[PDB]
PDB file of C-alpha atoms (C1' of nucleotides) and ligand atoms in Angstrom:
ATOM      1  CA  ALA A   1     -38.348  31.841  35.443  1.00  0.00           C
ATOM      2  CA  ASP A   2     -38.241  28.377  33.977  1.00  0.00           C
ATOM      3  CA  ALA A   3     -36.714  28.976  30.735  1.00  0.00           C
ATOM      4  CA  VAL A   4     -34.074  30.498  32.467  1.00  0.00           C
ATOM      5  CA  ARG A   5     -34.270  27.082  34.607  1.00  0.00           C
ATOM      6  CA  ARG A   6     -34.227  24.855  31.570  1.00  0.00           C
ATOM      7  CA  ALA A   7     -31.183  27.080  30.464  1.00  0.00           C
ATOM      8  CA  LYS A   8     -29.336  26.718  33.503  1.00  0.00           C
ATOM      9  CA  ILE A   9     -29.251  22.541  33.919  1.00  0.00           C
ATOM     10  CA  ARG A  10     -28.151  22.236  30.073  1.00  0.00           C
ATOM     11  CA  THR A  11     -25.171  24.094  31.614  1.00  0.00           C
ATOM     12  CA  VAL A  12     -24.101  22.503  34.414  1.00  0.00           C
ATOM     13  CA  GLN A  13     -25.035  19.073  32.566  1.00  0.00           C
ATOM     14  CA  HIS A  14     -22.212  20.641  30.098  1.00  0.00           C
ATOM     15  CA  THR A  15     -19.741  21.110  32.624  1.00  0.00           C
ATOM     16  CA  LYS A  16     -20.225  17.403  34.312  1.00  0.00           C
ATOM     17  CA  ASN A  17     -20.810  15.393  31.219  1.00  0.00           C
ATOM     18  CA  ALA A  18     -17.527  17.310  29.330  1.00  0.00           C
ATOM     19  CA  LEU A  19     -14.960  15.042  30.407  1.00  0.00           C
ATOM     20  CA  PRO A  20     -16.928  11.431  29.862  1.00  0.00           C
ATOM     21  CA  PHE A  21     -18.561  12.822  26.771  1.00  0.00           C
ATOM     22  CA  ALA A  22     -15.110  13.529  25.321  1.00  0.00           C
ATOM     23  CA  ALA A  23     -13.514  10.042  25.687  1.00  0.00           C
ATOM     24  CA  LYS A  24     -16.942   8.200  24.203  1.00  0.00           C
ATOM     25  CA  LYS A  25     -16.403  10.263  21.231  1.00  0.00           C
ATOM     26  CA  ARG A  26     -13.022   9.854  21.095  1.00  0.00           C
ATOM     27  CA  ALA A  27     -12.999   5.709  21.397  1.00  0.00           C
ATOM     28  CA  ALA A  28     -16.397   5.908  18.570  1.00  0.00           C
ATOM     29  CA  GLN A  29     -13.415   7.579  16.205  1.00  0.00           C
ATOM     30  CA  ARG A  30     -10.582   5.450  17.268  1.00  0.00           C
ATOM     31  CA  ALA A  31     -12.813   2.359  15.741  1.00  0.00           C
ATOM     32  CA  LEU A  32     -12.803   3.954  12.371  1.00  0.00           C
ATOM     33  CA  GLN A  33      -9.153   5.170  12.731  1.00  0.00           C
ATOM     34  CA  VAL A  34      -8.021   2.172  10.972  1.00  0.00           C
ATOM     35  CA  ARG A  35      -4.596   2.944   9.081  1.00  0.00           C
ATOM     36  CA  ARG A  36      -4.175   6.313  10.749  1.00  0.00           C
ATOM     37  CA  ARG A  37      -0.913   8.447   9.448  1.00  0.00           C
ATOM     38  CA  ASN A  38       2.228   9.069  10.553  1.00  0.00           C
ATOM     39  CA  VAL A  39       2.862  12.130  10.412  1.00  0.00           C
ATOM     40  CA  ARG A  40       6.332  12.731  11.743  1.00  0.00           C
ATOM     41  CA  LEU A  41       7.675   9.749   9.284  1.00  0.00           C
ATOM     42  CA  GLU A  42       6.402  11.433   6.314  1.00  0.00           C
ATOM     43  CA  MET A  43       8.044  14.622   6.850  1.00  0.00           C
ATOM     44  CA  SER A  44      11.087  12.669   7.443  1.00  0.00           C
ATOM     45  CA  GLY A  45      10.436  10.780   4.279  1.00  0.00           C
ATOM     46  CA  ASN A  46      10.100  14.250   2.763  1.00  0.00           C
ATOM     47  CA  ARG A  47      13.854  15.235   4.333  1.00  0.00           C
ATOM     48  CA  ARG A  48      15.430  12.561   2.818  1.00  0.00           C
ATOM     49  CA  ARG A  49      17.365  13.511  -0.713  1.00  0.00           C
TER      50      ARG A  49
ATOM     51  C1'   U B   1     -65.251 -12.630 -71.605  1.00  0.00           C
ATOM     52  C1'   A B   2     -69.217 -17.385 -66.187  1.00  0.00           C
ATOM     53  C1'   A B   3     -72.496 -14.720 -66.251  1.00  0.00           C
ATOM     54  C1'   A B   4     -75.417 -13.584 -59.012  1.00  0.00           C
ATOM     55  C1'   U B   5     -75.992 -20.962 -56.812  1.00  0.00           C
ATOM     56  C1'   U B   6     -81.247 -18.980 -52.498  1.00  0.00           C
ATOM     57  C1'   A B   7     -84.878 -23.406 -46.069  1.00  0.00           C
ATOM     58  C1'   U B   8     -82.210 -16.791 -43.416  1.00  0.00           C
ATOM     59  C1'   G B   9     -82.493 -24.082 -40.758  1.00  0.00           C
ATOM     60  C1'   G B  10     -80.894 -20.459 -35.811  1.00  0.00           C
ATOM     61  C1'   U B  11     -79.940 -14.381 -34.015  1.00  0.00           C
ATOM     62  C1'   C B  12     -79.187 -13.436 -28.679  1.00  0.00           C
ATOM     63  C1'   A B  13     -73.043  -8.733 -28.647  1.00  0.00           C
ATOM     64  C1'   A B  14     -69.225  -6.463 -25.198  1.00  0.00           C
ATOM     65  C1'   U B  15     -68.166  -5.561 -20.030  1.00  0.00           C
ATOM     66  C1'   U B  16     -66.988  -8.512 -13.326  1.00  0.00           C
ATOM     67  C1'   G B  17     -61.889  -5.251 -13.399  1.00  0.00           C
ATOM     68  C1'   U B  18     -56.716 -10.897 -11.342  1.00  0.00           C
ATOM     69  C1'   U B  19     -51.102  -8.264 -13.613  1.00  0.00           C
ATOM     70  C1'   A B  20     -45.560 -12.044 -20.268  1.00  0.00           C
ATOM     71  C1'   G B  21     -42.610  -4.595 -17.739  1.00  0.00           C
ATOM     72  C1'   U B  22     -36.681   0.431 -19.632  1.00  0.00           C
ATOM     73  C1'   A B  23     -40.591   4.912 -20.521  1.00  0.00           C
ATOM     74  C1'   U B  24     -39.972  10.458 -20.977  1.00  0.00           C
ATOM     75  C1'   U B  25     -42.231  17.263 -16.208  1.00  0.00           C
ATOM     76  C1'   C B  26     -35.820  22.397 -20.268  1.00  0.00           C
ATOM     77  C1'   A B  27     -37.502  22.599 -15.717  1.00  0.00           C
ATOM     78  C1'   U B  28     -36.727  19.868 -11.522  1.00  0.00           C
ATOM     79  C1'   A B  29     -32.580  17.208  -9.355  1.00  0.00           C
ATOM     80  C1'   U B  30     -27.552  17.397  -7.950  1.00  0.00           C
ATOM     81  C1'   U B  31     -23.253  20.812  -5.531  1.00  0.00           C
ATOM     82  C1'   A B  32     -21.386  25.489  -1.651  1.00  0.00           C
ATOM     83  C1'   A B  33     -23.535  28.872   1.444  1.00  0.00           C
ATOM     84  C1'   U B  34     -29.095  30.301   4.842  1.00  0.00           C
ATOM     85  C1'   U B  35     -26.768  25.135   8.772  1.00  0.00           C
ATOM     86  C1'   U B  36     -22.146  21.483   9.482  1.00  0.00           C
ATOM     87  C1'   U B  37     -20.757  18.146  13.977  1.00  0.00           C
ATOM     88  C1'   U B  38     -16.602  15.433  16.622  1.00  0.00           C
ATOM     89  C1'   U B  39     -12.075  14.732  17.758  1.00  0.00           C
ATOM     90  C1'   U B  40      -6.571  13.924  17.918  1.00  0.00           C
ATOM     91  C1'   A B  41       0.525  16.981  20.408  1.00  0.00           C
ATOM     92  C1'   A B  42       5.274  12.907  18.774  1.00  0.00           C
ATOM     93  C1'   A B  43       9.064  11.012  22.133  1.00  0.00           C
ATOM     94  C1'   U B  44       7.404   3.449  21.869  1.00  0.00           C
ATOM     95  C1'   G B  45       7.816  -3.659  26.582  1.00  0.00           C
ATOM     96  C1'   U B  46       6.783  -8.801  21.118  1.00  0.00           C
ATOM     97  C1'   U B  47       8.131 -13.434  23.481  1.00  0.00           C
ATOM     98  C1'   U B  48      11.095 -17.950  24.281  1.00  0.00           C
ATOM     99  C1'   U B  49      15.722 -19.994  24.336  1.00  0.00           C
ATOM    100  C1'   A B  50      21.238 -24.488  25.388  1.00  0.00           C
ATOM    101  C1'   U B  51      23.953 -16.344  27.113  1.00  0.00           C
ATOM    102  C1'   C B  52      28.321 -11.368  25.025  1.00  0.00           C
ATOM    103  C1'   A B  53      24.966 -16.545  20.774  1.00  0.00           C
ATOM    104  C1'   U B  54      21.947 -19.412  18.681  1.00  0.00           C
ATOM    105  C1'   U B  55      15.374 -21.398  17.339  1.00  0.00           C
ATOM    106  C1'   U B  56       9.823 -18.718  15.785  1.00  0.00           C
ATOM    107  C1'   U B  57       8.177 -13.938  14.487  1.00  0.00           C
ATOM    108  C1'   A B  58       7.544 -12.097   4.874  1.00  0.00           C
ATOM    109  C1'   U B  59       4.004  -6.315   2.585  1.00  0.00           C
ATOM    110  C1'   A B  60       3.586   1.048   7.777  1.00  0.00           C
ATOM    111  C1'   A B  61       3.842   5.971   5.071  1.00  0.00           C
ATOM    112  C1'   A B  62       6.014  10.236   1.709  1.00  0.00           C
ATOM    113  C1'   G B  63       8.983   9.750  -2.781  1.00  0.00           C
ATOM    114  C1'   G B  64       9.465   7.919  -7.531  1.00  0.00           C
ATOM    115  C1'   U B  65       5.146   4.702 -11.868  1.00  0.00           C
ATOM    116  C1'   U B  66       2.652   0.652 -13.693  1.00  0.00           C
ATOM    117  C1'   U B  67      -1.382  -3.262 -20.288  1.00  0.00           C
ATOM    118  C1'   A B  68      -2.184  -7.703 -17.194  1.00  0.00           C
ATOM    119  C1'   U B  69      -2.208 -11.186 -13.169  1.00  0.00           C
ATOM    120  C1'   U B  70      -1.713 -15.952  -9.952  1.00  0.00           C
ATOM    121  C1'   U B  71      -0.069 -20.001  -7.411  1.00  0.00           C
ATOM    122  C1'   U B  72       6.189 -21.561  -2.837  1.00  0.00           C
ATOM    123  C1'   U B  73       8.051 -28.696  -4.558  1.00  0.00           C
ATOM    124  C1'   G B  74      10.657 -26.511  -0.159  1.00  0.00           C
ATOM    125  C1'   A B  75       8.981 -23.825   6.127  1.00  0.00           C
ATOM    126  C1'   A B  76       3.959 -24.608   8.367  1.00  0.00           C
ATOM    127  C1'   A B  77      -0.665 -27.935   7.967  1.00  0.00           C
ATOM    128  C1'   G B  78       1.574 -32.896   8.510  1.00  0.00           C
ATOM    129  C1'   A B  79      -0.265 -38.080  10.884  1.00  0.00           C
ATOM    130  C1'   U B  80       4.424 -45.140  13.506  1.00  0.00           C
ATOM    131  C1'   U B  81       7.122 -44.333   7.222  1.00  0.00           C
ATOM    132  C1'   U B  82      10.895 -41.530   3.555  1.00  0.00           C
ATOM    133  C1'   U B  83      14.482 -38.744  -1.926  1.00  0.00           C
ATOM    134  C1'   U B  84      15.838 -29.861  -0.145  1.00  0.00           C
ATOM    135  C1'   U B  85      10.286 -35.471  -4.343  1.00  0.00           C
ATOM    136  C1'   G B  86       4.546 -33.188  -3.763  1.00  0.00           C
ATOM    137  C1'   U B  87       3.089 -29.796 -12.774  1.00  0.00           C
ATOM    138  C1'   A B  88       4.214 -22.021  -9.043  1.00  0.00           C
ATOM    139  C1'   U B  89       7.991 -18.486 -13.160  1.00  0.00           C
ATOM    140  C1'   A B  90       3.330 -19.113 -17.801  1.00  0.00           C
ATOM    141  C1'   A B  91      -0.700 -17.182 -22.845  1.00  0.00           C
ATOM    142  C1'   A B  92      -5.461 -14.379 -25.562  1.00  0.00           C
ATOM    143  C1'   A B  93      -7.427  -9.710 -23.998  1.00  0.00           C
ATOM    144  C1'   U B  94      -9.239  -4.308 -23.308  1.00  0.00           C
ATOM    145  C1'   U B  95      -5.553   2.766 -22.101  1.00  0.00           C
TER     146        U B  95
HETATM  147 MG1  LIG C   1       7.014 -30.087   5.891  1.00  0.00          MG
END
RNA sequence: UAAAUUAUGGUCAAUUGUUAGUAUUCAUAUUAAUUUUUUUAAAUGUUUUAUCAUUUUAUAAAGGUUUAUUUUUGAAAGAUUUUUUGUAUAAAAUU
């Protein structure tokens, strides 16, 4: 009975903390995102002849 | 071919753990799997001016390809001084 109780709140905390955890791990990657690639400029740069 | 010189009148050792620094496993370690994790969907407001203008704002990517590199006198710094003057443009060297 308690093993299902441990499994229930782990999925309950996952539904609540899906949105705020996705914002912090996005901002943690943006600090390491020095000189991101612009993909629409490389695809327009390959189009030029 | 110098021929054994004669108080042997001083023996009682070494080890108390304190070091002038590349040290070797042909089978173990590095790689991918038994395991990876987390995101991202473009379409964009730099600003002051004397106003249809003028003053300040000098290294984004792909492509093409390089033996090598750095420092403006000029703009600013910057001053009760002033000449667009204050030695920047080069060499050796190693695919
Ligand atoms: Mg000056």
